[PDB]
Scaffold this motif. Structure first.
Motif, mmCIF file in Angstrom:
data_model
loop_
_atom_site.group_PDB
_atom_site.id
_atom_site.type_symbol
_atom_site.label_atom_id
_atom_site.label_comp_id
_atom_site.label_asym_id
_atom_site.label_seq_id
_atom_site.Cartn_x
_atom_site.Cartn_y
_atom_site.Cartn_z
ATOM 1 N N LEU A 21 -31.569 -86.454 -34.754
ATOM 2 C CA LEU A 21 -30.636 -87.573 -34.792
ATOM 3 C C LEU A 21 -30.283 -87.848 -36.242
ATOM 4 O O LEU A 21 -29.100 -87.957 -36.600
ATOM 5 C CB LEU A 21 -31.250 -88.832 -34.151
ATOM 6 C CG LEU A 21 -30.307 -90.051 -34.064
ATOM 7 C CD1 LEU A 21 -30.644 -90.890 -32.852
ATOM 8 C CD2 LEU A 21 -30.401 -90.886 -35.324
ATOM 9 N N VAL A 22 -31.314 -87.949 -37.079
ATOM 10 C CA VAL A 22 -31.108 -88.204 -38.493
ATOM 11 C C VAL A 22 -30.370 -87.039 -39.144
ATOM 12 O O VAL A 22 -29.460 -87.247 -39.939
ATOM 13 C CB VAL A 22 -32.435 -88.454 -39.204
ATOM 14 C CG1 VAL A 22 -32.202 -88.614 -40.688
ATOM 15 C CG2 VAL A 22 -33.075 -89.704 -38.648
ATOM 16 N N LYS A 23 -30.745 -85.811 -38.807
ATOM 17 C CA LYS A 23 -30.046 -84.669 -39.367
ATOM 18 C C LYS A 23 -28.575 -84.762 -39.002
ATOM 19 O O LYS A 23 -27.712 -84.585 -39.849
ATOM 20 C CB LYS A 23 -30.593 -83.359 -38.829
ATOM 21 C CG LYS A 23 -29.827 -82.169 -39.376
ATOM 22 C CD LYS A 23 -30.312 -80.867 -38.770
ATOM 23 C CE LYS A 23 -29.452 -79.694 -39.243
ATOM 24 N NZ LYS A 23 -27.992 -79.946 -38.979
ATOM 25 N N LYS A 24 -28.280 -85.030 -37.737
ATOM 26 C CA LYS A 24 -26.886 -85.143 -37.339
ATOM 27 C C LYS A 24 -26.172 -86.240 -38.127
ATOM 28 O O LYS A 24 -24.996 -86.102 -38.462
ATOM 29 C CB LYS A 24 -26.769 -85.427 -35.840
ATOM 30 C CG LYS A 24 -27.253 -84.291 -34.961
ATOM 31 C CD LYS A 24 -26.429 -84.199 -33.673
ATOM 32 C CE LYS A 24 -26.922 -83.068 -32.761
ATOM 33 N NZ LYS A 24 -25.918 -82.730 -31.709
ATOM 34 N N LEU A 25 -26.877 -87.330 -38.420
ATOM 35 C CA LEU A 25 -26.277 -88.423 -39.173
ATOM 36 C C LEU A 25 -25.917 -87.958 -40.568
ATOM 37 O O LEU A 25 -24.812 -88.196 -41.042
ATOM 38 C CB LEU A 25 -27.235 -89.596 -39.248
ATOM 39 C CG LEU A 25 -27.385 -90.332 -37.920
ATOM 40 C CD1 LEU A 25 -28.403 -91.480 -38.054
ATOM 41 C CD2 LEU A 25 -26.007 -90.846 -37.497
ATOM 42 N N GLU A 26 -26.852 -87.293 -41.229
ATOM 43 C CA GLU A 26 -26.595 -86.771 -42.559
ATOM 44 C C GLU A 26 -25.455 -85.777 -42.506
ATOM 45 O O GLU A 26 -24.720 -85.628 -43.467
ATOM 46 C CB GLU A 26 -27.834 -86.087 -43.111
ATOM 47 C CG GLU A 26 -28.868 -87.047 -43.616
ATOM 48 C CD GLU A 26 -30.141 -86.351 -44.000
ATOM 49 O OE1 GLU A 26 -30.916 -86.934 -44.765
ATOM 50 O OE2 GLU A 26 -30.384 -85.225 -43.534
ATOM 51 N N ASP A 27 -25.307 -85.075 -41.392
ATOM 52 C CA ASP A 27 -24.206 -84.123 -41.281
ATOM 53 C C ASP A 27 -22.898 -84.895 -41.105
ATOM 54 O O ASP A 27 -21.906 -84.643 -41.789
ATOM 55 C CB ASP A 27 -24.391 -83.167 -40.083
ATOM 56 C CG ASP A 27 -25.387 -82.039 -40.363
ATOM 57 O OD1 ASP A 27 -25.493 -81.592 -41.530
ATOM 58 O OD2 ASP A 27 -26.056 -81.583 -39.409
ATOM 59 N N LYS A 28 -22.918 -85.856 -40.193
ATOM 60 C CA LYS A 28 -21.743 -86.642 -39.905
ATOM 61 C C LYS A 28 -21.306 -87.580 -41.026
ATOM 62 O O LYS A 28 -20.162 -87.527 -41.475
ATOM 63 C CB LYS A 28 -21.984 -87.442 -38.630
ATOM 64 C CG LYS A 28 -20.721 -87.935 -37.969
ATOM 65 C CD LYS A 28 -20.927 -88.013 -36.470
ATOM 66 C CE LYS A 28 -19.609 -87.865 -35.706
ATOM 67 N NZ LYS A 28 -19.809 -87.907 -34.215
ATOM 68 N N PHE A 29 -22.215 -88.432 -41.490
ATOM 69 C CA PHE A 29 -21.870 -89.415 -42.515
ATOM 70 C C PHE A 29 -22.100 -89.046 -43.950
ATOM 71 O O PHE A 29 -21.617 -89.737 -44.834
ATOM 72 C CB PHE A 29 -22.625 -90.721 -42.287
ATOM 73 C CG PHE A 29 -22.382 -91.342 -40.957
ATOM 74 C CD1 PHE A 29 -21.179 -91.138 -40.285
ATOM 75 C CD2 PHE A 29 -23.338 -92.172 -40.394
ATOM 76 C CE1 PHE A 29 -20.929 -91.748 -39.074
ATOM 77 C CE2 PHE A 29 -23.102 -92.792 -39.180
ATOM 78 C CZ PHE A 29 -21.891 -92.582 -38.517
ATOM 79 N N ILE B 3 -29.357 -88.309 -27.940
ATOM 80 C CA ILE B 3 -29.222 -88.683 -29.343
ATOM 81 C C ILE B 3 -27.780 -88.914 -29.724
ATOM 82 O O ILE B 3 -27.487 -89.754 -30.560
ATOM 83 C CB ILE B 3 -29.850 -87.638 -30.283
ATOM 84 C CG1 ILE B 3 -29.231 -86.269 -30.019
ATOM 85 C CG2 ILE B 3 -31.379 -87.634 -30.104
ATOM 86 C CD1 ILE B 3 -29.731 -85.196 -30.967
ATOM 87 N N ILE B 7 -26.170 -91.972 -31.539
ATOM 88 C CA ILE B 7 -25.406 -91.766 -32.763
ATOM 89 C C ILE B 7 -24.019 -92.367 -32.604
ATOM 90 O O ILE B 7 -23.435 -92.838 -33.571
ATOM 91 C CB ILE B 7 -25.279 -90.275 -33.102
ATOM 92 C CG1 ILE B 7 -26.625 -89.763 -33.615
ATOM 93 C CG2 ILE B 7 -24.161 -90.058 -34.122
ATOM 94 C CD1 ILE B 7 -26.744 -88.258 -33.701
ATOM 95 N N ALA C 42 -35.292 -84.475 -43.621
ATOM 96 C CA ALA C 42 -34.642 -84.635 -42.311
ATOM 97 C C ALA C 42 -34.083 -83.337 -41.729
ATOM 98 O O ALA C 42 -34.442 -82.943 -40.614
ATOM 99 C CB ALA C 42 -33.532 -85.690 -42.385
ATOM 100 N N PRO C 43 -33.179 -82.661 -42.465
ATOM 101 C CA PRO C 43 -32.614 -81.410 -41.956
ATOM 102 C C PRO C 43 -33.679 -80.353 -41.728
ATOM 103 O O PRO C 43 -33.550 -79.525 -40.830
ATOM 104 C CB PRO C 43 -31.628 -81.019 -43.045
ATOM 105 C CG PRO C 43 -31.133 -82.328 -43.499
ATOM 106 C CD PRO C 43 -32.424 -83.110 -43.645
ATOM 107 N N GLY C 46 -35.087 -81.183 -38.508
ATOM 108 C CA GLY C 46 -34.084 -80.980 -37.475
ATOM 109 C C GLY C 46 -34.055 -79.507 -37.100
ATOM 110 O O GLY C 46 -33.852 -79.135 -35.940
ATOM 111 N N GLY D 30 -27.183 -77.609 -45.683
ATOM 112 C CA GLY D 30 -25.931 -78.351 -45.607
ATOM 113 C C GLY D 30 -25.971 -79.643 -46.411
ATOM 114 O O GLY D 30 -26.186 -80.742 -45.877
ATOM 115 N N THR D 32 -25.121 -82.787 -47.858
ATOM 116 C CA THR D 32 -24.153 -83.819 -47.515
ATOM 117 C C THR D 32 -23.882 -84.797 -48.667
ATOM 118 O O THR D 32 -23.037 -84.519 -49.528
ATOM 119 C CB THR D 32 -24.603 -84.565 -46.260
ATOM 120 N N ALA D 35 -19.813 -86.877 -46.829
ATOM 121 C CA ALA D 35 -19.368 -86.072 -45.698
ATOM 122 C C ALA D 35 -18.701 -86.969 -44.671
ATOM 123 O O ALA D 35 -18.212 -86.432 -43.652
ATOM 124 C CB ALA D 35 -20.556 -85.350 -45.067
#
Lengths: 128, 40, 128, 35
Positions: A21-29, B3, B7, C42-43, C46, D30, D32, D35
């Motif tokens: 979830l956190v990884k996705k957040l760092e990816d997204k935001f 998730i 999110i 985090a990543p 993940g 990756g 960020t 991003a």
């Protein structure tokens, strides 16, 4: 959802789910904007990781004694963790102590695959 | 995935609510800004 | 250890070890000082999460179909996940989709236990 | 434990090096930040 429900939901997350979830957040935001949740969720993930051990969703490999063969017990440890002499050695020298955990958050399969090997270097290895 | 639902729910939060989220999460796990004791 | 030594060492930790490490760092050094390692790890966790799944260590529960009573399935999903009503409905209506994952990072019997609960609501579910 | 062992290592990396370790980790998976 409501703040409370996002919390309850988050608190019901698997350590793996939290991590992703956190990884996705760092990816997204981006890492900056997502860091707030990253640091706030970590204690939640750690708690859970700790609950898994506490139960049996995961197991650790605790060193109980390096014995006659300590230089090898170490050699092995480093092959397993990626540590360094001093580190791997400081750890190995904790054999018999609770701290002496060489791995955790693992299934009860690797628990043996690593335990065995640690015994293969002549070492006391107890699982939990 | 679940998730993603979360999110998506976090993404919709205003910045102050996200700050409420963080506050509730941090108050609960006794997290602190600054090493509690001196790591000197 | 050298930075690479440490990065190597880090990339060998389990999702839980990363969880517990970051948490420990936060409690000891505060979130401010700990935040860098938190958002950098985090990543890594993940990735570990994924690896676990992709290696049948840790399993997930995918919804193949929400069955004859979509509402009953949403109720259960909401019970399992803490997810709000609309997000639960959203997720359940993805039944059949690969990302209709209700939960993941869980043990086998736990994955079964969840599966059973969804089945009792009339849903078709697969484990992976 | 091993994580403690890893924390002790990170704990003595001078502000740089840690900044280094951070960027290296962020680049691998990756980077960020924005991003």
């Amino acid at each position: 959802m409501t703040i409370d429900e996002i919390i309850e939901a988050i608190e019901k997350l698997t350590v793996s789910e939290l991590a992703e979830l956190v990884k996705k957040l760092e990816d997204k935001f981006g890492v900056t904007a997502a860091a707030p949740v990253a640091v706030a969720a970590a204690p939640v993930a750690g708690a859970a990781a700790g609950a898994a051990q506490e139960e049996k969703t995961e197991f650790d490999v605790v060193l109980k004694s390096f014995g006659q063969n300590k230089i090898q017990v170490i050699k092995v440890v480093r092959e397993i963790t990626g540590l360094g002499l001093k580190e791997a050695k400081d750890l190995v020298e904790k054999a018999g102590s609770p701290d002496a955990v060489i791995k955790s958050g693992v299934s009860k399969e690797e628990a043996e695959e690593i335990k065995k090997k640690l015994e293969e270097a002549g070492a006391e290895v107890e699982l939990k | 995935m679940t998730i993603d639902e979360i999110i998506e729910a976090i993404e919709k939060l205003t910045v102050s609510e996200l700050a409420e989220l963080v506050k509730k999460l941090e108050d609960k796990f006794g997290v602190t800004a600054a090493a509690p004791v001196a790591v000197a």
